[PDB]
Design an enzyme around this catalytic site. Structure first.
Site, mmCIF file in Angstrom:
data_model
loop_
_atom_site.group_PDB
_atom_site.id
_atom_site.type_symbol
_atom_site.label_atom_id
_atom_site.label_comp_id
_atom_site.label_asym_id
_atom_site.label_seq_id
_atom_site.Cartn_x
_atom_site.Cartn_y
_atom_site.Cartn_z
ATOM 1 N N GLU A 18 -33.066 0.051 -71.747
ATOM 2 C CA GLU A 18 -31.106 0.358 -71.042
ATOM 3 C C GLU A 18 -30.049 -0.474 -71.392
ATOM 4 O O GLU A 18 -28.597 -0.502 -71.861
ATOM 5 C CB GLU A 18 -30.904 1.103 -69.583
ATOM 6 C CG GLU A 18 -31.096 -0.403 -68.840
ATOM 7 C CD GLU A 18 -32.968 -0.955 -68.620
ATOM 8 O OE1 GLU A 18 -34.303 -0.606 -69.576
ATOM 9 O OE2 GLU A 18 -33.303 -1.386 -67.567
ATOM 10 N N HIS A 76 -36.748 -4.216 -71.097
ATOM 11 C CA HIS A 76 -35.611 -3.125 -70.920
ATOM 12 C C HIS A 76 -35.018 -2.670 -71.883
ATOM 13 O O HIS A 76 -33.740 -3.134 -72.287
ATOM 14 C CB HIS A 76 -34.540 -3.991 -69.494
ATOM 15 C CG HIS A 76 -35.062 -5.422 -68.443
ATOM 16 N ND1 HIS A 76 -34.851 -3.631 -67.089
ATOM 17 C CD2 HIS A 76 -35.772 -5.382 -67.914
ATOM 18 C CE1 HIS A 76 -35.423 -4.348 -66.223
ATOM 19 N NE2 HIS A 76 -35.783 -5.569 -66.654
ATOM 20 N N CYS A 121 -39.768 -2.617 -67.153
ATOM 21 C CA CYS A 121 -40.605 -4.114 -66.937
ATOM 22 C C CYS A 121 -41.821 -4.394 -65.795
ATOM 23 O O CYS A 121 -42.842 -3.274 -66.381
ATOM 24 C CB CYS A 121 -39.512 -4.837 -66.707
ATOM 25 S SG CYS A 121 -39.776 -6.426 -66.703
#
Ligand SMILES: Nc1ccn([C@@H]2O[C@H](COP(=O)(O)OP(=O)(O)OP(=O)(O)O)[C@@H](O)[C@H]2O)c(=O)n1
Ligand SMILES: Nc1ccn([C@@H]2O[C@H](COP(=O)(O)OP(=O)(O)OP(=O)(O)O)[C@@H](O)[C@H]2O)c(=O)n1
EC number: 6.3.4.2
Lengths: 557, 278, 278
Positions: free
Chosen positions: B243, B241, B121
């Site tokens: 993750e 993102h 990001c």
């Protein structure tokens, strides 16, 4: 480092300090770390010998030195803790060089006003300009140097030499000068010639002004700016003008709107100086727009009752502490000046007319203030002013001698004990309301709230913090033997010292606002952070105290 | 599927019992370690695929700054030792502007010296600000957050905030890409987003021509979803993102590449030397 | 003069008995520690004036290079930890071209972050190549050693080799200078030289206008003998070798400034808080 001299004129009293700290308040708008030095041409080493009748109030430092009164104007405008060294004086610097002469630090040379003493002055200015006076421990980025007296005085001649040499010891593009000068208006015409003759004087001693700033009764005419700039080495856009304004707190906005800083930014090349500074710059502007808005956006009448109130500079800090707080309350301040002795029952036969004027002021006021006077004379009237606010629920603040008189009155009227008096009336012995405590107690000392007093109006204004830190100037305290009797009768001592032996604050239980402080809170009032005992006095005089404590008047959401 | 889940658990467990990889995670307020929790877990899931022990160095991004050297010198040396030691750099998708100036110097450190990198990001934003600020010159360029500079804003507003699972499509020529190899040569991916800014489309041809190739874009082709720097061992960023979709048996591919290249084994992970069952 | 020499010996001895300063010395083949012997002794003489313990970190300049990261990664991290740790940087006047690319990045590290710096001979050459390569853009610029590039040579031949004790004169406006303050405000200095190249005079106005002010030049005013970067805590270089006139009771001024600024005490050394006898 960068530096700004403020100097000049054909007269003393022209306007320097407001052009000085005001210029320094705008250096902080840029995010800069800022400091100030006042160079005084007088021969006193400190104000500790100077009686408050002439040269006015002995302003008191964090470091407890009795300084020049004007230093205070820089601790309000900038929000800095100065030191005893930031007040250079002619007596201080001759003493320092004469000490080195008898110690022999000149290696047996003869010691001369030039170069040795003019080196000492430069070595003092650049020494003091390192000291971290600001809200973080880094050295300042700009120093504002105010040169007192007038250029061409036989008293100011050593300092204009030292500052000339300093224009080279420091570089050009690091040093700049603002010269403050007179445009008298007679026959309705602005005359330029006193500025020409005083600029002739200035260039003779070798300083050159990067700005001129005029004391004038008017807005300078377009031709007056041109006829000054045709006679001095400044563009017509650097003839600044501190004209009549709604209040003294507007002057840094007046200077900024006259593009004063948009020149100093380039002239001191201030692009050559972190995100914390850039943010704290924008926040200082927002807080200035807030206190300014609070002036544009109803009156509060306060009787200030003390000795010799005719000598209005002798109470200067008290006035400024009431002004800072009144802008938080959005209310216009109207101080009634009362001579305390004109309240006395004896004054009624002696000087009846002034006695009625004094009592009308006391009877009119929305609040009473006993300001920490000098000596005993006013005491008998100040008792009757404290009685007037104890009985009738008028808001009150007693400062120093005002706590002493709040306690003498509460003794003299609530406990009976009509013979009781200050320890100043020494040979009465048994009825002395006070005790000697020489340690004079001075400087920043803590004060701790008594742990049960959750009801207190004053400890609410301090944000429920466990302790406060404040300036003192007292040789007497309330006699500890009596304090249980006063606490049991309701004159609750809501704050005491580290030992718990010393009477630092009182609040009268179940009164709308009746406070006194043994300390002088006006020596830590700041324009964006008003001193809490004075904020409570104005807010309760406005009948708004609850809502100020609840937060209806903080500057940013 | 029960027996397979046990076998895959025995595999990730075996990969812990069966050498260290050091990664600098560089961002705002890294003291607040729960504020990066998903990023840590995404590095853990991938590190068990690589059989290598994970050692995250926590760097406060602001301690890298040239200003920190006079302000707080001791912590500035600790921060730079971590950046200099690490086998990979990770800019984790921080909150707000404060850390940006140090995160630029961490991206520069991995662009120039061939250190493996992932930007998430704000990390893609800073990979693009750095590549602009050092490869194109353009030293005044900054995030759209510095609004009143106007002409030198590296980004543009796109409020639609863009959120939730959206697709991303590989640009059809980019067969060389290390990241689109980790995704198994599949035509598209689906990922979580949380962004109000994107890289200004006006500049993207200049960045593509200079080698900061945007290997993945959205359905319209207007939005910058992935970049890979052409001919670097592993320098990726994602606007999403990743993750938020890492799983213990299926590690999120942008983080698997960061660990595997930090281990110097990226080729063999792509070729399949580390899948859990034959 | 006998009793005074004993008193001055008791002073330098007392200054050893009576805190550490860490300095990275960055050059070619620093393994060959006798090859820098004079530089070490010049740092020792000055460190006893500052009362501070000297800790030279030895950095091979080539281990800083972006190429060293794939070739010999372990030593590259050791080199960068030393550069990142040090309270001062020193480029010592190396022999031949090999170390240059890493010595540029060490000069950049101390230009940007306010680390104290001294460049000696090839160190002034590299202070000027770096300030050219990063402040003026001009990324192709190099030493005159890369002869066939012609247009982008940062230096010019001046064989007269220039050797032995020659004067150097301060430029008459530079009253701000940290280095000309350490020389006691004297009008000129005398120093040893060993150089065949000097900074190309054609460029020097551009460098002076951008702030790399050449605070000292030769008798003719054509030759670049000292530079100081305007408004940095201590960033000096000398074309001469000042370590060939450092003495144990009179330390060579460019090295005294490097230690004193690494100690954060430079002002007070100039003001006289550290002379041996009152
Ligand atoms: N920031 C300031 C500056 C000045 N004043 C007040 O204005 C008067 C003095 O103004 P100053 O600026 O010092 O001018 P003078 O002393 O009259 O003249 P000079 O220029 O010589 O200082 C005093 O009431 C002082 O407290 C103030 O309240 N706040
Ligand atoms: N030629 C003079 C006259 C006076 N002073 C000193 O400098 C101070 C300047 O104060 P000032 O306001 O000038 O007092 P006056 O001389 O009376 O001027 P004014 O008439 O304006 O008060 C004097 O108090 C005195 O200390 C001086 O140095 N040189």
């Amino acid at each position: 480092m960068k530096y700004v001299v403020v100097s000049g004129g054909v007269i003393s009293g022209i306007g320097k300090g407001v052009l000085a700290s005001s210029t320094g308040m705008l250096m902080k708008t840029l995010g800069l770390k800022v400091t100030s030095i006042k160079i005084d041409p007088y021969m006193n080493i400190d104000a500790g010998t100077m009686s408050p009748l002439e040269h006015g109030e002995c302003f008191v430092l964090d470091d407890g030195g009795e300084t020049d009164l004007d230093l205070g104007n820089y601790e309000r405008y900038l929000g800095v803790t100065l030191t005893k060294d930031h007040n250079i004086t002619t007596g201080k610097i001759y003493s320092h060089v004469i000490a080195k002469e008898r110690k022999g630090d000149y290696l047996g040379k003869t010691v001369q006003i030039v170069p040795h003493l003019t080196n000492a002055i430069q070595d003092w200015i650049e020494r003091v300009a390192k000291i971290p006076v600001d809200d973080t421990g880094m050295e300042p980025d700009v120093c504002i140097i105010e040169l007192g007296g007038t250029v061409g005085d036989i008293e100011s001649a050593p300092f204009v030499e030292a500052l000339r040499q300093f224009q080279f010891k420091v570089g050009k593009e690091n040093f700049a000068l603002i010269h403050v000068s007179l445009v008298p208006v007679i026959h309705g015409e602005q005359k330029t010639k006193p500025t020409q003759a005083a600029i002739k004087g200035l260039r003779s001693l070798g300083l050159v002004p990067d700005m001129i700033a005029c004391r004038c009764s008017e807005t300078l005419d377009k031709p007056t700016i041109d006829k000054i700039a045709m006679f001095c080495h400044v563009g017509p856009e650097q003839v600044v003008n501190v004209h009549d304004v709604n209040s003294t707190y507007h002057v840094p906005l007046l200077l900024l709107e006259q593009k004063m800083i948009d020149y100093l930014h380039a002239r001191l090349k201030l692009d050559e100086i972190t995100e914390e500074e850039k943010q704290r710059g924008l926040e200082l502007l927002s807080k200035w727009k807030a206190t300014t808005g609070n002036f544009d956006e109803e009156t509060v009448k306060i009787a200030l009752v003390g000795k010799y109130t005719n000598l209005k500079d002798s109470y200067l800090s008290v006035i400024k502490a009431l002004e800072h707080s009144s802008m938080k309350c959005r209310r216009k301040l109207d101080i009634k000046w009362v001579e305390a002795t004109d309240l006395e029952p004896e004054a009624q036969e002696s000087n009846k007319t002034k006695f009625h004027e004094a009592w009308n002021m006391v009877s009119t006021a929305d609040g009473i203030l006993i300001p920490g006077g000098f000596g005993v004379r006013g005491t008998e009237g100040m008792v009757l002013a404290a009685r007037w606010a104890r009985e009738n629920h008028i808001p009150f603040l007693g400062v120093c001698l005002g706590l002493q008189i709040a306690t003498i009155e509460f003794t003299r009227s609530v406990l009976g004990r009509k013979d009781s008096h200050s320890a100043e009336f020494y040979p009465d012995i048994d009825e002395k309301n006070h005790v000697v405590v020489f340690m004079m107690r001075l400087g920043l000392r803590p004060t701790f709230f008594q742990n049960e007093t959750e009801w207190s109006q004053i400890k609410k204004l301090y944000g429920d913090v466990s302790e406060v830190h404040e300036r003192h100037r007292h040789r007497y305290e309330i006699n500890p033997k009596m304090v249980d009797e006063l606490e049991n009768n309701g004159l609750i001592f809501v704050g005491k010292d580290d030992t718990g032996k010393r009477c630092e604050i009182l609040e009268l239980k179940n009164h709308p606002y009746y406070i006194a402080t043994q300390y002088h809170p006006e020596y830590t009032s700041k324009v964006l952070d008003p001193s809490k005992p004075f904020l409570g006095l104005v807010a309760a005089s406005a009948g708004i105290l609850q809502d100020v404590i609840e937060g209806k008047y903080d500057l940013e959401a």
